[PDB]
């Protein structure tokens, strides 16, 4: 019956993101509890902050500065994030970080225990909480527990470099259900596990390792098509309505993401440079806007990527700019999601070219936001999880800047008929694998496990 | 009475060049000067004749270039004279090459010289030139003009070879500077080393060598600036004149070098954006700066920093439909730049140190006197001694620069008119023609040794 | 039954070269290979003959060099194959040039080929070489040996041209790798693209093309290493042998490249100094690393960082009479390096990724078996599959590396002996002679198409 | 009668530096009070911390983090220090910094007032307290107040770039007595004042500006020769005694200072490089040791110079180093002054080549520390204040690295007879202008002013 969801952050009643709509859909159906970090530092030793509306309860706690630094800044974001995105060169393994990561998981488990009921189903989200099922088991919780990894799971040759990889695998197997964005992530997890210990598998997705039974499954996260199309078709704020009108004979190429090195933003700028260099006929007639709010700015590698991006914006505009034409608009700013939907609708090209992305919701949002009668074009990296389902996109390899540039040109000149075709085929896939479908499949699978 | 001018680079228009040509057109004579590469190391000089002027040019070796021009002149003299001892990179092989090429240049000029010539030498690459001429017996009236600042003793005396440089400069009969403070700095430097006697106004003796000093602040040709500024824009440029009906333009153009204080400028615009949010969406700062002298130690670390700062500032303050800062690392025709000046509401000229800065004067000569923009000018620019009606600022105080910018953007037509008319009267009175004529007339008056 | 070897750079000694020479001395034949500059772009190949071996070399254009060797091979293939996709810099002009030069090289070799030849191609610059040979009708047995790692699909498939590279590699009759995991990675890459059939042990079909794969971990010549190591030091070098009676020496030598994890190494020594203060004044870490391939994008940003880190670490932990870290950016003779190995108490070989790493094997072959040092070896070095008795570490865990270092410095003679004797037996059994003979014998067994 | 001294830091009874011995000499003679910052951040609102031994009292206060940042880190060390050392390119003028600088001076004056007596003579030290006389006057203190500037005072063309230069001059004239290290500093101050306002001068050193009367004077700070020679002749700690013996056929070149950009440390390393390059006969037979403890490490320009120095040490040793010979020993470490005296005595060459230095006590310490019967050689920059009196040093221009290298070679090979001559002439100058002489002259001059 009751659903408990915990994740690193939680969204209480009063700007609803992609994951939030999914969690809330699940919680609204079952009723239950959403538990996680308040996003605040300091004053940890105040009671849990609780809200209750109808059937759902929201609960949060603060974290100390040390715990945040070792758990979130260091281990999560400077070890697991770079490794799981195939950047060994960036991980900063240190023992205190690893100890902090275990400490906060144990802390969270301790806070959570009194709030649990015997029949609860428990859903844990993301790489911050890899050890969490294990911490629950050692505290006597026998409940069904599922995990969803929102990011890629790396192959053995990368995963096995983590000094702590073996402990991570052992603890992952304390979940009854492990969910991944793509088939390759699930396979990679099983591949790392099989390299470490004997695994017994039945029908691809049911396993035993060290005598522990667990299932695996793929649930590619999605969007709410009806909500996005509503938001997207709504009027722009007055100042932005004015701008849309002023851009009548300007084609807009648009990108938005957190400012992360996984997103390949410099490589993208270089591709835009390549478009400007080799297709001069677009000069003065196109614009590329990149919205990239700072993310995890306490972490050196994130400051580094931001500085690199600032330089490239200045260099490209410095070289291809004219007195009355700025080629590249770079905004280190966060935009409301409801507004982004409107901006996607008026953008001729959506450019989503990450080097590695668990899924990438921006790509699904962009084509849901389109006017089906006059849709823009998605240019999508083959390394985004989304590329598995959005095969009608212009799929590209961001390591070949000339290919990305060619695809940008192709997108800018595509006929109405072909834009519609490609759009309708993508939209059909994302309407058939909804965010509702995504949470319903996960919860249905979780309810099926016979608890220990 | 022939005039022989020599200067670094030549021209078979510009600003200094109109002054040299004007001086040559009056007297008749010869312009003698260098031209980069090599094209041909061991070749006869280029003797090309118009009517009164005879034009002669010559090459160089890549070894001479590096020690002479790329090293001593531009890695010791230029940074030191602009108050940056931290940027001097003295090596004796380069001092030696500096003297070598001066002596070479002197060797090629000697044959082309006539007894009754008056001779006029330009700028810091040729501080030693009159000494090398004296060593060859030439007794002619020779004058020097220094285009950059002359530093105070506490800076100049750090130069390992300051005392030679000082002995050599006193072989000129006349030494011209852009400001009184440059003239005084030189005299103070010379006074710290040796006894100098001033028996009458601006007339000196040191080590028994007689010489004069004087101030000739280089000027502009106001008519031609106004003519060029007034002309029709290229089509694509008149597409953003009435597109920015409600957007005011702050404008700067210069060479990339450490003396111009470009990052400091970006910081000042940031401070304007930060503390005066009224202006968002309604102003723009455009900076043009073509790369220069990235050959030795490459000041090009400043290009990189400007790229970063444009990206940073735009990323913070920009909007989907508004880019606060336009940074262009591109070459623009002089003619077009004159038109941009005219259509820009604010001229931002804030070097950290500048001999004169002709851009400040061009900006106000290019203005429509009926509806002129405002000049914001650094007090460390030599032009600030005369352009007293400019908004004068200390670039080390970015908030003062921002407040000036705010003041310039809100200034009434009446005040914009009287400030501009005031500056303009000054530039018309001391034009490039007046400048050259004053220097020549003074040089002519000297009795040769 | 002739052997034709081709490899990048040649030699009219080393390690691979003794293997190629040994294989050529047995069969007789020809070594065919490149040599940098140009010296002469359009010149006949260099046909120099000993007795059984005939040696042929040729030049190249600076455009071919940059796209072929400086770009695709070393800016795409090398970083990708060492698990650094973030360092790949793919441009199609360089892919094209990569194919161009392979085809050129194939054109010059064709005439020098004989019907009954066996052919042996070395390393990643020539992945396409057997395809270009097939296009010219040569049906000979051709084998390939890859000296560097072959990456897993998740890395390899990122290469814009991975599928061509895969089709081309299957034109070799035999493909040799340094480890089982490289062999498996290749097969997994090929399996992701197309159906491959393995009807019998290590024998495959793909697109109807038959080929074999196998593991030949490159080895050393143990006798000559021991001989060179045992010889008398140059005087000045035997001045610090018994000056450091009470000071133990940790020693590493390699090329500067990102795969070697040099800054990570310095960090590990710091962690040793930080957490084991017993060792202060009593140990030293010496790193030799000559600069390499600073031509394109210049990994030389690592030189700079090592300079910084040596200065930082010594500045923190040094004393008036003790320098913890000796970093030398200098070339040392092979002979001398063998002697340094022998007199060093700890051999530190901790690359982030390495095909094999011959230094690990040299270090233990050079040891006095009566009083040998300890090898600390990265698990990411191909040599770690065989040198199981080494102290095996994860360089991503600097404290584990430090603890290994501490363990190596305190290790009893008895344990130092059995670990070394164990590693040494392995290197003697699989020596450079065994390696070449195994590859040749397998290549000979194939029935030509 | 009673002397009050205030300075940014104070030295209570229980390692006595150069300035401290001078202050304490003065205080011991008059009796009185030494007042200043404790060096501690936080908990400002605890009572003044007071000690009393015989006739002297020591008093200190803590400063808040904000006050420290704006007063000490920002205005003092990132504006006044770079400007007064001719580095306009490094000053970081911002209004809040300037306001903080005034605030802390006012704060110090407020703390100090109740502790004053009508007949006190008051001695203020250094650029942190330029406004301090002024703050005292506005609080009704008529006492004789003297100031000593320990660093250079820059010419008008540099001074006048400080946005706040005019206020600084006005406030300086509230002192009855202003003391400088050299005649050029005093002249430079008067030059800046004369450029701003009409100054009336009698007999060079007695002035009026804005109707305010004040005197100027030069007091070049010095050393305690008898104490230094005692310390220097004492036995080395056992481990260092061992090292001295092991270096019998090695010539030592030695330098020590705070790691400051005023000291020209990179330029010095470059000169050592030049010695190694052009005089190879010293290879394996000399060593250069540079001790350079971090100073003001919170300030970006100080982190920058430290990083530059680390790189150059690694590069030089990387290039000229041998398996059993390290050319350059760099220690980012602070050494006790009593020990340094011993190290100076066993060093063949003292290398003191700052780009700009008010005086530089290390240079005077080095020759006081020498065995007069076998003295080492001082190589001294012409830009140290000390060069005015130590004319028998090998005087050099650090902007000419080949000249410094030549002087190093000359020093390394100098005959006993010439070493003795040069040493004895320097020692005579520093024994005749003692630290005792320095404080006695200052106090004698201060007692002479007729208080307002
Ligand atoms: O200014 C901004 C920037 C982004 N977004 C929204 O933020 C979300 C970004 O999600 P996504 O594009 O998926 O990227 P990620 O931030 O990286 O989040 C991680 O989690 C998502 C959920 O599983 C996966 O799709 C990703 O691959 C995973 O890296 C989208 O809904 C955006 O519309 C905003 O609302 N405002
Ligand atoms: O590890 C160290 C480093 C230095 N010192 C001592 O610190 C003092 C340094 O004083 P100085 O050589 O004069 O340099 P500064 O630190 O710069 O101090 C400033 O104040 C001194 C007193 O007026 C003037 O000589 C300087 O020119 C001025 O810049 C000397 O007594 C050194 O022996 C130590 O005891 N241990």
Swiss-Prot record, chains A, D:
It comes from the Bacteria. D-glucose 6-phosphate binds at residues 9, 72, 126, 296. It catalyses: D-glucose 6-phosphate + UDP-alpha-D-glucose = alpha,alpha-trehalose 6-phosphate + UDP + H(+). CDD domains: GT20_TPS. Activated by potassium and other monovalent cations at 0.25 M, but partially inhibited at greater concentrations. Inhibited by validoxylamine A 6'-O-phosphate. The record marks 81, 151 as: Involved in alpha anomer selectivity. Keywords: Glycosyltransferase, Potassium, Stress response, Transferase. Its EC number is 2.4.1.15. Homotetramer. Catalyzes the transfer of glucose from UDP-alpha-D-glucose (UDP-Glc) to D-glucose 6-phosphate (Glc-6-P) to form trehalose-6-phosphate. Acts with retention of the anomeric configuration of the UDP-sugar donor. Essential for viability of the cells at low temperatures and at elevated osmotic strength. This is Trehalose-6-phosphate synthase. The lineage of its organism: Bacteria, Pseudomonadati, Pseudomonadota, Gammaproteobacteria, Enterobacterales.
């Amino acid at each position: 019956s009751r659903l408990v969801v915990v994740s690193n952050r939680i969204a209480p009643p009063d700007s609803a993101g992609g994951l939030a709509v999914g969690i809330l859909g699940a919680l609204k159906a079952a009723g239950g509890l959403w538990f996680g970090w308040s996003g605040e530092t300091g004053n940890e030793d105040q009671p849990l902050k609780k809200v209750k509306k109808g059937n759902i309860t929201w609960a949060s706690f603060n974290l100390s500065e040390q715990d945040l630094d070792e758990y979130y800044n260091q281990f999560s974001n400077a070890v697991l994030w770079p490794a799981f995105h195939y950047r060994l060169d960036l991980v900063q393994f240190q023992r205190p970080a690893w100890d902090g990561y275990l400490r906060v998981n144990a802390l969270l488990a301790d806070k959570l225990l009194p709030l649990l009921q015997d029949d609860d189903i428990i859903w844990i989200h993301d790489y911050h909480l890899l050890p969490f099922a294990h911490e629950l088991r050692k505290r006597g919780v026998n409940n069904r527990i599922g995990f969803f990894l929102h990011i890629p799971f790396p192959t053995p040759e990368i995963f096995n470099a983590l000094p702590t990889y073996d402990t991570l695998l052992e603890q992952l197997c304390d979940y009854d259900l492990l969910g991944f964005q793509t088939e390759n992530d699930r396979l990679a997890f099983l591949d790392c596990l099989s390299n470490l210990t004997r695994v017994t598998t039945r029908s691809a997705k049911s396993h035993t390792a060290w005598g522990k039974a667990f299932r695996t499954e793929v649930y590619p996260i999605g969007i709410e098509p009806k909500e996005i199309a509503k938001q997207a078709a709504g009027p722009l704020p007055p100042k932005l309505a004015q701008l849309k009108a002023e851009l009548k004979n300007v084609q807009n190429i648009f990108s938005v993401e957190r400012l992360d090195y996984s997103k390949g933003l410099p490589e993208r700028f270089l591709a835009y440079e390549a478009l400007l260099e080799k297709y001069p006929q677009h000069h003065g007639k196109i614009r590329y806007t990149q919205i990239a709010p700072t993310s995890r700015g306490d972490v050196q590698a994130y400051q580094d990527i931001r500085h690199q991006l600032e330089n490239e914006a200045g260099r490209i505009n410095g070289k291809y700019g004219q007195l009355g034409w700025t080629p590249l608009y770079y905004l280190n700013q966060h935009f409301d999601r409801k507004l982004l939907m409107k901006i996607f609708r008026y953008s001729d090209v959506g450019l989503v070219t990450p080097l590695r992305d668990g899924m990438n919701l921006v790509a699904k949002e962009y084509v849901a936001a389109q006017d089906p009668a006059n849709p823009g074009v998605l240019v999508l990296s083959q390394f985004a999880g989304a590329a598995n389902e959005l095969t009608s996109a212009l799929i590209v390899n961001p390591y070949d800047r000339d290919e990305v540039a060619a695809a940008l040109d192709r997108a800018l000149t595509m006929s109405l008929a072909e834009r519609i075709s490609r759009h309708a085929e993508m939209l059909d896939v994302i309407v058939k694998n909804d965010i509702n479908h995504w949470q319903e499949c996960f919860i249905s699978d979780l309810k099926q496990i016979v608890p220990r």
